Each structure stands twice: as structure tokens, then as C-alpha cells.
Design a protein around this ligand. Sequence first.
Ligand code: NAP
Ligand code: NAP
Ligand code: NAP
Ligand code: OXL
Ligand code: OXL
Ligand code: OXL
Ligand code: CL
Ligand code: CL
Ligand code: CL
Ligand code: CL
Ligand code: CL
Ligand code: MN
Ligand code: MN
Ligand code: MN
Ligand code: NA
Ligand code: NA
Ligand code: NA
Ligand code: NA
Ligand code: NA
Lengths: 555, 555, 555, 62
Amino acid sequence: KKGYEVLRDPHLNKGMAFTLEERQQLNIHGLLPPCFLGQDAQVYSILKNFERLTSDLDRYILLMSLQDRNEKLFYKVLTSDIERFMPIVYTPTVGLACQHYGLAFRRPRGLFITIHDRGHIATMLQSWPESVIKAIVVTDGERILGLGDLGCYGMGIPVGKLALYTACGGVKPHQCLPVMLDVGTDNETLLKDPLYIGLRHKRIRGQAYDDLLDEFMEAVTSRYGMNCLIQFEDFANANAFRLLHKYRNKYCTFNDDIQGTASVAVAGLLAALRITKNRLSDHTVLFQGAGEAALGIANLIVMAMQKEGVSKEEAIKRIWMVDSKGLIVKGRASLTPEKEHFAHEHCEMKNLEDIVKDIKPTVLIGVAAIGGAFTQQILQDMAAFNKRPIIFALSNPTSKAECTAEQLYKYTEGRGIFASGSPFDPVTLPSGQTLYPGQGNNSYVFPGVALGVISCGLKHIGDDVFLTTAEVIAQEVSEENLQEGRLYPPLVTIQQVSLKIAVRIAKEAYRNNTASTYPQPEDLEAFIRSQVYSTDYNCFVADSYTWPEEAMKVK
Amino acid sequence: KKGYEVLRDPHLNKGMAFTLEERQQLNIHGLLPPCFLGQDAQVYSILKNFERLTSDLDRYILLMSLQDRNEKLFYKVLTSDIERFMPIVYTPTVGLACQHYGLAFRRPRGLFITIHDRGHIATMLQSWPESVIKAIVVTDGERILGLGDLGCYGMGIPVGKLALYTACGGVKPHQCLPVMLDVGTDNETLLKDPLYIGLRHKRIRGQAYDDLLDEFMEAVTSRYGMNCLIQFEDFANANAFRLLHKYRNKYCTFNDDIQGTASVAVAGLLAALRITKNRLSDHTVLFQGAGEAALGIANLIVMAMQKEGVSKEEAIKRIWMVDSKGLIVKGRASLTPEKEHFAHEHCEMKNLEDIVKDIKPTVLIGVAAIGGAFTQQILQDMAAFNKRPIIFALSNPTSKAECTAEQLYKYTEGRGIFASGSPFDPVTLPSGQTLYPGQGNNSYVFPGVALGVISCGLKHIGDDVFLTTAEVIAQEVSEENLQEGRLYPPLVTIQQVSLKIAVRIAKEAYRNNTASTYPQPEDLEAFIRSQVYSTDYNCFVADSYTWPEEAMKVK
Amino acid sequence: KKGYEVLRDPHLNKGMAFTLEERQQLNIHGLLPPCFLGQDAQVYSILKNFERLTSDLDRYILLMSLQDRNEKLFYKVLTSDIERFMPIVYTPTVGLACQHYGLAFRRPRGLFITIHDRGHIATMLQSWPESVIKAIVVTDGERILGLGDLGCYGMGIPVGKLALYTACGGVKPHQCLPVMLDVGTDNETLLKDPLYIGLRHKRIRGQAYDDLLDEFMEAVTSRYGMNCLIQFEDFANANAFRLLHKYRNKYCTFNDDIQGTASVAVAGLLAALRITKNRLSDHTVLFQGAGEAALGIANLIVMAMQKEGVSKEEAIKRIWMVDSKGLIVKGRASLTPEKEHFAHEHCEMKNLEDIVKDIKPTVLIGVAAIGGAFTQQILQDMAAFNKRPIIFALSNPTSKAECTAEQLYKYTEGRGIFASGSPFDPVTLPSGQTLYPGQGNNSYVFPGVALGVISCGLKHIGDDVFLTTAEVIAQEVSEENLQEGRLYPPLVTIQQVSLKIAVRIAKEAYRNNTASTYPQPEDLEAFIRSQVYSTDYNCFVADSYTWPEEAMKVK
Amino acid sequence: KKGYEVLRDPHLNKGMAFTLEERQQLNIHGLLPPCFLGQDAQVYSILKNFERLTSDLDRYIL
Ligand SMILES: NC(=O)c1ccc[n+]([C@@H]2O[C@H](COP(=O)([O-])OP(=O)(O)OC[C@H]3O[C@@H](n4cnc5c(N)ncnc54)[C@H](OP(=O)(O)O)[C@@H]3O)[C@@H](O)[C@H]2O)c1
Ligand SMILES: NC(=O)c1ccc[n+]([C@@H]2O[C@H](COP(=O)([O-])OP(=O)(O)OC[C@H]3O[C@@H](n4cnc5c(N)ncnc54)[C@H](OP(=O)(O)O)[C@@H]3O)[C@@H](O)[C@H]2O)c1
Ligand SMILES: NC(=O)c1ccc[n+]([C@@H]2O[C@H](COP(=O)([O-])OP(=O)(O)OC[C@H]3O[C@@H](n4cnc5c(N)ncnc54)[C@H](OP(=O)(O)O)[C@@H]3O)[C@@H](O)[C@H]2O)c1
Ligand SMILES: O=C([O-])C(=O)[O-]
Ligand SMILES: O=C([O-])C(=O)[O-]
Ligand SMILES: O=C([O-])C(=O)[O-]
Ligand SMILES: [Cl-]
Ligand SMILES: [Cl-]
Ligand SMILES: [Cl-]
Ligand SMILES: [Cl-]
Ligand SMILES: [Cl-]
Ligand SMILES: [Mn+2]
Ligand SMILES: [Mn+2]
Ligand SMILES: [Mn+2]
Ligand code: NA
Ligand code: NA
Ligand code: NA
Ligand code: NA
Ligand code: NA
């Protein structure tokens, strides 16, 4: 393609990086100022623009616009200082963006499918420029992080997730599709908000909702193929599980919040074991929350424990859960079949601190979006019953973190092992030792899992894929990392980590013959490495070459 | 047109204003959130976005992006509150933008022709999406406002002018082309500036430059037609004049800085006469500056006086000028033929205040871009020998204004009649009366002159056109306006004033047979009104309708 | 798509079959006369146009132009009377077309890859509008039917083959790509021909040629996938066999001339056995020719005989061949490894008639492109030592057929069982009985084999596929068919036969796990039927529908 | 503009008169046979096609 149409297509636009000869051939010479530069120069300019801003939202908006203008440059900047820009494009800033999505909105991104478009989804996929999609992150916006129902403002998440698909996983941008399934919203505040971009009516539930979802899945895989990876993100509890169970074995799909979190959670405990000097089956885990994350994580912990040689029954007995009504115990009221799995014989309790004192767990996991649930008392108690207690404040965004790295280390005398879903700066204990709290976030799992699935075309994703991936991650945590308090490999190495996760997933796929990409590559690492996205700009010059002169003569 | 490419075309893009039916027919249903809204709603969000910003530079980028995303919306927002947004799109903010163009740069706009493209201009015009252009604003960036040589960063100016072409004149945006002729820059600072977007070398002068200009004019008129309007803007002294004289009679062109300024300046004096209760031939004008603006304004003033009944010779004797070397007197050194035209018998002088006290003028016009040249002294002196002195601080941007509205009104005890190139807020005198200083800026002239020339196809623009336009503008100043201290009709009525300027120019054109649009309209006003740009969106639904039924049958 | 561009795209163009509403929405209303018609009406006008022509070459051109104008209409016409149009679009007219390709040329069709394009094939595949190709028919034009080296004029063959892919097989036209690999031509006549459209130089051979082919296969499968079907057609002997052997197990490819012909020839023998009332192992085959067709057929026959219980050695003993040097016997000079395979101990012989009298075969197959090789004497001899001799004049086009249907039936006194590569009209014997000579032509094999490979994605095509296909075809020959003298099912049922061929190929592909399309359909016949091409026009009206009214409300 | 779309537009289409370089830049190299001819060589082939016709209506259609 050519002309000014190129400058408006972010997948093609190189900006002033366009060569004098490229510009001339593309019929755009004169539409750009008379200066030519490389990505480094362009990155410089962006940083000057980023530096001068004075609000995270403004930084977000700046980057989102870059993403809408020059694809390569966007990712070049992202990967240039992942630790610096991820907090803007992903948690916690992405939640802030979703809260003001109507305000931050500029150019649309993604595919918005409505409950009112039932029976016409197949047609709408046509509207999407790309005809070859290999991955999709979808949400209905009912459980945006620990922020609740943000309706159509929730589109910010899929966009963020996919940003890492490329930035941290190497998955090509052009093959991914962020999707919003707006069936309404129960958030009264949004329904009254003048800037709200979604349907102004309560969420439609029941059979209608279910049929919408079936059509979506059927339509996507029909157009893009049965190998298309569908990643559910931030759906409400009930919907999340039923949908997973319903499609898990029918399509190539998985739920990030349920399975991706479990993977990273276990990856941290597996790593923590090298500090606590014991076996996972010697621990006693207590969850604040009993939803998607808790239930997903708890299940993976059990599989991990059985792998150690313990029985399924013994493993489940070491896992305790607390929901909005209190400690989940046998015979308690308001219990679900899934919760009943961890209902143990015990009197009922409501106060979290009393529960911590009673259960005396070795691992405290926070996944209930409850502010500073992990108070100094709770933290002190953990430091009291444990030589080195493991503390996981997983709720996102930052404002929902069960506790801070600072407080964790402060109230546990620097003996607590910490991890959180949202980023925290390093902490220098009184002893002068600087600890670097790790980020237990999906971000360590979904990019590699995607690179993997897409690479070998794994037909379906079993729970073993996440357990194995939890091991691959932990295997990348160095002794040096561990000594700094890191339960995960440094973020700057995320790409390398993703590759390994991808290669490992491929090896298993072919082994169990669940793969689809054939013939099988003689060297999987080499093959996947060659399938990864490249930050470099392509050359838009026509492929000119000469023929012998006799054969090229004009008659 | 078609699909997503529609959403990237600002001339077409309607954003969420596209109807469900339009989106479905345009193959973009799904690419936009599930909410449909009108322009009012769209303007609201834009304002909430403009409101939260905290820098003029930022507000500029905001609007500029808007213009790159939704044409109709952009202009709907500007005219919604011209007095509020013009300062952002035009003076003085536009000057600040030019100073930091490299930084503010996002998406390119306009046509950038280089000195190294000599012999290829014709082809480059093709790279421009539009093949039908009626107006063109060119600059080489050597004299950007009173900011000097800003090289390629000067592109911001033609874009500003054109913005007003539409917003103030009603000229259709799609038919206008902003152009930057980059032949280098002598600004050592820019040459070292890492963000500079132009050619990194001193300006090329001599015959190479002249050939480039001739080619440009030729290229532009051959492609777009002889009737194409070429507006020269912000060129250096020497070039501005010779280029104007060189193409004046050959093509449809004029120089905004020399002729447009002259027109508005005369319009103001004509209005002031109704406060000073005398005739223009009764005044004595003193110009701080003897450049493009000064010489142009002086020339029109002379014509205006002669039209009163005074002789050429007598008129000239009433104009005094001061340049970098001091008062322009007969037999002084460093004099140009143009300047020696106003060189009177008198002793040399350099001190401005002493010059004011010696010549004792009734009107003081500042056009030398000298900060606060009109000091307390000067202003007091003026209010001393003049019952009601006329003070014109025309230099731009604000930072160059010879003096402020507050200063003028205070140091002239409220008896001074003020006007300036850049905007100043209302002033409330100690007497309790609030004055609304007018803005003597080209903006009152070029929009209407363009509407006029384009509408009737006036082959060439003579000085009479600007004198007539000056009378037209003054004619629209009401007694009420005068009573408030306005030498110009309120800015909120600028569209109507442009209409009358256009209608007038048309009538003259047909009378003198210099028009080209035939047959001549019976009602010039009605004709022009129907030629004006509309801010309303068009409907993108296919024009569907039925034929009988026997004729519509399928055989 | 939209606009006049639609009318020029044969894959979209519906002609006057475009609905008024379609024309209005596609922006073509007014570009077509004021009448709307159905396909039947359109076919009628085509037939009127075909009727008035007076030459086969002109009928060819008419139909080729139809194909370049309206795709569906083209195939609608072909399938409306396959027995009438196939002889025009295929053998023998296609051979005539190729001989005058330069003269018949109008609009180009297919992909022309030259030997001078080595190292740039991948680039050239981009030039091709479709990015999703599933089948390709390639030729270098060195052995076009029995007409020899027709160089670039040979493009007519791949175009013809693919015409039947769709017409007889049901394969989608847009997913197929006809390719010509021009490396020159040794035909002195064409080099001198002023209308020749290929490279005017002797064919390039050796390593250069082999590298071009490797690059071709690599580029095609890299861009279109390893499952892309590559059908080699009309390559010279040496090149045909080595290319087949070299890529056979590496890509999804087969050689129509060697393998397709084998399949159809055995299909006919299988059917013939039901007339001769005996087993294949009871016959003695004699081939007039020892090349691509001869060796391929000979090979399939052997496999067929072994499946009856006979050993490989015993089977080979029943097959004799004659080449340009005469009867192929042990120790004979100028023999090939492949030929030596059938070199039996026997005295050398050169005269075909004498050879027939000596070997006394029960099956006479002609594949040497030798005019009327099967003389009256030979035909009489065959009817002398065989109650019911089986005569196959497989050489194409008709002017190369070993003998005519009339001649065969006349000189065998109506006892000879006939079949030919090119069509012959029914024959009414003196007894009054009318026989319908069958057509033993690849056309019975490649369409169905293609529909099958493409459908289930069979990685590689082994000879078993052709042997089973032969059985599938013979299975479709009814008792009635046989009684009329038909060795193959009637042409009018070819689409039904192809389907059966495909469903069987699929079944075995999944059984042997050599398929690629997964999950496997529960009903293969139903799946494949749903994938077949539809001759009906699509509806180009936008998918319009409404949402509730509150959700459609414009703010 | 470019691509096979150019071959279909009679105002732009040059047939085999398109140069090797033109074809490569227009993204149509390969859509035309490996032969380059001038207008007169093209006229010649038109005349041969005209000559063999035997009806004015056919010559009209050609
Ligand atoms: N990688 C990561 O770091 C990651 C990944 C996914 C999710 N998360 C975070 O985890 C949080 C929840 O996600 P989810 O998917 O698990 O949501 P969910 O399914 O809604 O689960 C939330 C749970 O918290 C419980 N809860 C509410 N108030 C409580 C209270 N006062 N005391 C104890 N428990 C209480 C709820 O109880 P009931 O059962 O009574 O309703 C519910 O079971 C979010 O903030 C999210 O951002 C982090
Ligand atoms: N509509 C409007 O409000 C409008 C329109 C056009 C221009 N302007 C303003 O007018 C200003 C100049 O524009 P221009 O085109 O006339 O520029 P120009 O051609 O550069 O002329 C500037 C003149 O000022 C003289 N000068 C410089 N310093 C002086 C000093 N210290 N004391 C006395 N005279 C001095 C120069 O003298 P020499 O000849 O000796 O060098 C020169 O004649 C700009 O700031 C611009 O913003 C306003
Ligand atoms: N589906 C169909 O019905 C179908 C498909 C493919 C081909 N065919 C036809 O089969 C014929 C041959 O094609 P091919 O691909 O097999 O070509 P090929 O590989 O060149 O084989 C031709 C063979 O005929 C031999 N020959 C030449 N003159 C002979 C003569 N006077 N007496 C006996 N044998 C002679 C040649 O012998 P040497 O080796 O000594 O040179 C050669 O072995 C063509 O006319 C073609 O149209 C029909
Ligand atoms: O749900 C979340 O909070 C996440 O995935 O980071
Ligand atoms: O030059 C200027 O400042 C203008 O034209 O307003
Ligand atoms: O080459 C041939 O003769 C054929 O394919 O039928
Ligand atoms: Cl850039
Ligand atoms: Cl013919
Ligand atoms: Cl012949
Ligand atoms: Cl038949
Ligand atoms: Cl139809
Ligand atoms: Mn999530
Ligand atoms: Mn200016
Ligand atoms: Mn063939
Ligand atoms: Na006919
Ligand atoms: Na053809
Ligand atoms: Na193989
Ligand atoms: Na033999
Ligand atoms: Na041609």
C-alpha cells in the first residue's frame, strides 16, 4: 500500500524514519519534514515528551497515542525501559485509565461487540482489518482488577494485556485482538456519567448472555481457526468459572485471572521454598478472598503439593480460605461447591486477625481487593509464628494492595518474604540491606503461555501447562535474586523468561501430541526465536533487480 | 468511503457520531464503542479534556491532535468559543508552538518543499491527497512573528492561518494547503537543536532560492489553476517585498504581513476617527519599525488620505518612521529606496522618547517587535499632546507587544485609544468603566479576502482591495463598540465580517471585470453564503431508493 | 469492495445481476444498463454468443473472456453442459489454444515466474492478489499434451486444469493459482514467432534450473503453508520423475501426468474386468510408449495386481512396453533404470504390428502421442486373439489419439472395449446398438484428489491414494454404464464422483493420521459438501439491522 | 496507485508494454508474461486478431 494512507496506519508508519527513497517511492515525499532519523532519535523525542508530563493519566494518554501512531516505535519505547513504562501501560496506571476511559479516549482500539449484536458477530469480525488473528484477550468488564464493574471502560485492560503480549512475550501485535463484550453495566455511577462510552443499561444476564458468548467463540474460531487462543480477562466470578469449564476442552482457551495468577503464585512459593528451606507440603496457606484468584491458586498449590508425593486429601487440608462472610468452614452457610472443597472442621470466625492467630499459617495470600487488610498486627503475628513468613499482597491496583513492601518488611523485622501484584520500589532495611520485592503478576505467565500456544498450536490448555510454567519461572530465579528478596526473575529479563516458558510448552505439546504445528521443528528454541516480533523497522523500498540484458530488451 | 480507513481520515472521521446504520454500511461497526452521540456531546468531552490541561503548549497539542482526528469536530470546537480557542490555535500560543515545534510534533501536516527538491515540485504536489486546492499559505520561516528565523519550525504558522481561514472565514479546509519552503535556517540554536525537523544548514540564498520560488509558483498554478490564491506569510523583509512585486500581477497572490496588516491597521484608524472626531488627513503617524508591516500600513494610510481629498505629497509628509538606526530623515545613512520615500527634512535622532516628543504624533504604531517600547514616558507624552492618542502595539506574539492594554489605559489616564496584534483582557478603569481593547491583527482581513477571491475568482489582488476591505471592517464597528474602546467589531462576529468583506470584493471584481467565476451570481451574498464551509456532519448512508417494480424485476 | 473497481473484479462482478439496492450501496448505480437479470438469463446470452461463433479458437476466447469478467457466471456456464464446454476449455481445444496462445491472448492470467527471477520468487508471490492459496498447478511447458515444447504458450494448461478443479471438483477458484515457470524454450518455431510471449532463448538446464525449482517450492509453502497442494503438469520426462521423487515426501505434491493418469487408467481396467469377466492378473498389457504416463500406469497396475494376490515379480511379467527405439527387452540399448524394470527376455522388435502379433496382449494402451498408431491391422489382430480386447488411445489432443472410437469399434467388429484421452462422439454399431466411449483422462482424478487433500490437509500423497481413487471411480461405473461401453461414470456425474474421491481420501488420511485439519469432522461427507464451491451469486447488501431504541439513542 | 488493479484500469494498463522496472515498482511483476514490447508490436498483434475475423460485428466487439 502507499500514499498518505501509510502515515495513518500505525502498523506501517515509520514517521520521519522513512528514507528519502522510501518516501519518494511511497508517494509521501513532502508530507514529512526534511529530516531523517533512527529509532534511537525518535525514542529520545518521546522521552522528552514523557519527562515533561505531570500526571500518570497524561503519561498513559501519551503512550496510547504513540501506540496509535507508530507501532514499532511504541514497542521500542516500551522494551527500552520495561520497569519504567510497564507501570504506565499496565498496572497500576491502566486501572486509573479504565476509571477515566471516557476522558482518556482519543482514537478507538479493539473490537466492541454488544449483546444487541447477537447473530451478527461473524459480520463484525470482517470489520476488523486483519483476517489472520492468533490470539484474543476478551473482557465484559464486570471485574476490572479490584476496581469492580467498569463496563465498557474496561477495554483498557485487554489493550494493556496485549501490550505485554508483545513487550514481554514477543507475540506479534498485528496478530492480536483486544475485545470488549458490552452487555451493559450495573455500575450506577457510570450509567449517570456523561462520558461513559458503553451501553447505558444494567447488564443483561441469563440465556441471552450465554448465547452471546457461544456465538462469540463459534464466530472467532470459524474465521480465525480452531487454534486461535482466547484469553478471558476480568469477568465476574460466576461467569469466569462456568465459561472456562464450558470452553476449556472445546477451544484453545484459558482464564488469566484464574489460571494465570495461579501459575505466578505457585512460581513464587516454589522460589520461596529455597529461602524457607522446606517442602511445599509442609506449609499451611491462608487466603484472604475465595474467588477466581484464590480458587485458581489453591488448586495449583494442591497439584504442586501432590507432585511432592503428598495425597490430594492431605494437600487440601493445608489450605484455608476467608470470604466476605468469614472463614470458610465445614457446614458454614453461604458456601459454593468450589468453596466447600476447602471447608474444614473448625468453628466459625469473621475477624481476619483472629483467624491468622488461630490458623497460624506459613503463607498469607491476599486476593480480595481489601485495602490494607494486612495490618501491622497481622504482619507482626506472621513474623511471630514464622521464622520467615511468606506474604502475598496480590490485589491490584496499588490502592488495593493488602499491604506495602515497606510495611511488610517493617512489621516483620525484615524477615517476611514479600510479593505483590502491583509494583513497589526497593526497600532498604535498617541494616542497610536493600530488598527488591517481586511482582507476582499474570504478566509473568500469559505472555509466554501465548508465545508457546501460538508457536506449536496447542489445541487445549490443561492445568499441567500452568504448573509446568510455574516451575519454568521459578527455575529462572537466581540465588542472587533470592538473596535480594526476589521471588521472581527481574522484570528486565521477562522476555527471556517468556521464551523458556514458550519452548517448554512446545516440547510438552509435541510430546503429548496436543500440538498442531507440523512438521515439528528440529530445534524448538531456534524456531520460536524466529517467530518473535521485531522492534526494527522494515524497508519499504521496492525489491528491484535486473534481468540479463537480452531477456530484458524491449521488442 | 470504506472500512477502518474512514476512521483514520480526519476529513471523514465522525467518531462516535457515526450512526449504527452508517457504521454497518461503512464496515466499521465494532471498531467504535457502543454509544452514539451528537457534536454537542463530543465538544463537551473535548472541553473536559481542555479544562484539565495546565499549559498552553499542551492545550495546543490537544487541539492539534483533534484536528488530525476529526475535522468537523475541530472546527466545531473553535467556533464554539472563538475568543477562548483562537489564542491557542493562533497568536500567541502558535508562536510558542513554533518555538517548540520539534517537541510538539506528533503527526505531520502540510507540504514541505525543500531547496533540494528543485525541479521536482510538480511531482511532490501529487503526493498531496487533494487535487483541488483553491488557497495556499506559504512561508520559508525566516520571519516568524517577532520571533525571528525559526526555520522549518515555522510550519506552525501556515497551519494557524489556515485554521482561521475556516474558523473565521468559512473557507473549506479541504481546499487549503499549508506549505513550508525549507531552504535552511541561519538560526545557530536550531541547527544545534536535536529536535529540529528542518534542513540542518544555513539558508541558501541567491539565484537558487529565486528559482525555487519561481518553480513553486509555476507548479502550483499549473496543477491547481491560475485562480489559485497564494498567500505569502512570514518571509524576511527583502524577500517579502521582491516576491510580492514579482508575482503580484502574474498570479493571484498577496503578502499577509505587508498588505493584510496594512488593511486591518487602516480599518482601526478609520474607526478611531469617530472617537477623535477628525479626518485621517488631520493626523500625524509615527511608526516604530520601518519593515514589512510599517511600509505596508504607511502605504495604505497614504491611499486612504488621498481618498479624503489630500494630495499624495501632502499625505506622505504626515508619516514618520524609526528603524534600527533611528529616525528616518532625509540624507540619513543606511536608507532603502522604500524608506527614503518617507524621509523628511529633519535632524537625526535615535532616542524613541525624544522622537515622540519632537514629532508629537497623534498616532503611535508599533511594528518592530520591541518588547515594551511604549514606556510610561512615551504613553504619558502621547496623552499630553493628544486629547485622545491612538496607540497601536501590533508586534506579535504578546511578549513582543510594544505595551499592554493595562499600561496604555493607565499611563494615558484612560484617554488612550488602544489596539494590539495579540489579545489582552478587558480593562476596568478607575472610573468603573470597562474597556474592551480590540485586536489589530491580519485575522480580520485574510479570512474574508480569501472567501472573496476564491468565490469570484479575482485574478489579481491590487491595493484597492485592501483599502476597500479596511472600510468594510470599520463599517462593522458600531457606536456601542466604540463606546467600549473597540476599534474593531467583536471577535465573535468575525464570520459575518468576513462574509461582508467577501461580498464586497466580489462586487468590485465583477464591476472591474477582474472576476473569473461566471456567469455572475444574481445575489452575490446568497451565492457566497452557500459556498461557506459547514460544521455539520454529512450522512454516510448510501442513497437508497426504489424504482417502480416491473422495472426493478429480475429476469 | 466498492465502486467501478467491483465491476472489474471477476471474482466480485455480478454484471446486470446486481440488485438495484446493491448497485446503490456499491456506488455503481448508473454504470450498468437499467435491467436486472438472473444467472439463467445471463447464461442464455452467453449461449447466444457461443452459438454464432464459427471456430473452436473463437469459442475458447469467448469463454476465457467470460472467465476474466464474471467468475460465477463462467463456472455456471461450464457446469450447465459439461460435455459441451469441457472440450472447449479443456482437451482438445486447450491444446489448440496453447498452440496459438500468443494470438488468443487478451488479459493475462496466472503467475509467470522466470529463471531470471531466481532469489525473488517470494517477492513475486506478493504480486498475487490472494494471500490464501491452497492449490497450485505448475508447468514449464516442455511437454504440453502430445504437442511438444510450447514454452510460455503452455500457460493454457494450468488454466484449463484449474477450470476443472472447480467445474468438476468443486474447489474454490480463488484458492487456486496457475503457475508458469519460464526458463526458455527449445522450440525453434516459437523463438521465431513474433507473437511468442515467453523468453526468446533456449531452455536453461542443469543446476540453475534445479535451484529455481527448489526456490519455488520453498517460497510457495513458506507463504501459503506446508499443506499447499502443488500439482506438477506437463513437464518433460526426466524433469517430471526427478522432481516428483525429490519433493514427494517433503511437500504436498504429485505429478498429474505420472500419477493422475495412472489412477484413471487403472480405474478403466478395473471396470473393464466386469465385461471381460476375469481378474486383472489374467491380462497382459502392452504399452505404446514408455514415458511418464506409461511408467506411472504400469506401476499402478502392478500394485493393483499384487492386491489380487499376485507377487510383484509375477505382476511385472505381464507388462510390456515399446518406446521410440522399439520393444523394451533385456540387454537392449538406450534403456533407463525405470524402463529396465520391464525389460523381459525376448528378441528385439521395432514394428508395432509385429509386436502385437507376438506378445498377443489383452490390453493395448497408447501413450506415445503417435497419430493413428492403432492401425486397422493392429485393431483386427487384437480382436483376433481376444474375445473382447481393451483398447486405450490415451494420447492427447484428439489429433494424437492412437485411433478413433469409430475405427476401434469398426475394426474389432464391435467387440473392442474402448477409452480415449480426448472425447469422441457416441458410435452406433451396425447392430443398431449405440456405444458411448469413455474418456480416460486425468480430469477424473485430480479434481477429486484436490478436493480431498485440501479438505483434510493430507501432508503427502503416496501411490496408495491413486490406487484407491481408481477403485472409487470404478465403483461408480454402473451395470448400465458398462452395457453402453462406458468404462467411466458419465461426465455429467463427475462432481459426484469427485466428492466420493475426496471423502475416501479424507477417511484414510485421518485413519493413517496423515491429515492436518483438526478437529476431525464427525461427518466427512457433510463437511466436504459444505466446503465445495457455489455457483450462486452472493448478496452484496450491507448487513443492516437495528438495536433497541434506547441503545441506539443519539446523545 | 498500484497492484493488479492497474492492469484492470484501461486508462493506466499498458499490458506487456510495462517495463521490468515499472512492473517491479507497480507490484505486478509476474502477472504478465516475461515479454516486453513497444506499442507497434502490440498494434501488430491487434491487426492479426482483426484480420482473421469474418464479421463486422465481430470486428466491432474486438
Ligand atoms: N496476577 C495478579 O496479581 C492478579 C491476578 C488476578 C486477580 N488479582 C487481584 O485479586 C483481586 C480479586 O480478584 P478475583 O478474580 O479473585 O475476584 P473475585 O472472584 O471477585 O474474588 C474476590 C473475593 O474476595 C472476597 N472478599 C470480599 N470482601 C472480603 C472481606 N471483607 N474479607 C475477606 N474476603 C472478602 C469475596 O467474597 P465472597 O465470596 O463472599 O463474595 C470474593 O470471594 C483483585 O483485586 C485482582 O486485581 C491479581
Ligand atoms: N496583524 C498584526 O498584528 C501583524 C501583522 C504583520 C506583522 N506584525 C508584527 O510586526 C513585527 C515586524 O514585522 P515586519 O514584517 O515589519 O518585520 P521586518 O521586516 O523585520 O521589520 C522590522 C522593522 O523594525 C525595525 N527595528 C528593529 N529594531 C528596531 C529598534 N530597536 N528601534 C526602531 N526600529 C527597529 C527594523 O529596522 P531596519 O530596517 O533598520 O532593520 C525593521 O525596519 C513583528 O513582531 C510582527 O509580529 C503584526
Ligand atoms: N490423462 C490422460 O489421458 C493423459 C495424461 C498424461 C499424458 N497423456 C498423453 O500421453 C502421451 C505421452 O505423454 P508422457 O507424459 O508419457 O510423455 P513422455 O514422458 O515424453 O513419454 C512419451 C513416450 O512415447 C515414446 N515414443 C515416442 N515415439 C514412439 C513411437 N513411435 N512408438 C512407440 N513409442 C514411442 C517415447 O519414447 P522414448 O523414451 O524412446 O523417447 C516415450 O517413452 C502424450 O501424448 C499425452 O497427451 C494422456
Ligand atoms: O486482574 C488483575 O488484577 C491482573 O490480571 O493483573
Ligand atoms: O506576522 C505576524 O505576527 C502576523 O501576521 O500576525
Ligand atoms: O498431458 C495430458 O495429456 C493430460 O494431462 O491429459
Ligand atoms: Cl518521527
Ligand atoms: Cl479454431
Ligand atoms: Cl496439432
Ligand atoms: Cl461422458
Ligand atoms: Cl445466483
Ligand atoms: Mn486480570
Ligand atoms: Mn505573519
Ligand atoms: Mn498433463
Ligand atoms: Na458455435
Ligand atoms: Na488461458
Ligand atoms: Na514425509
Ligand atoms: Na517390455
Ligand atoms: Na500487451
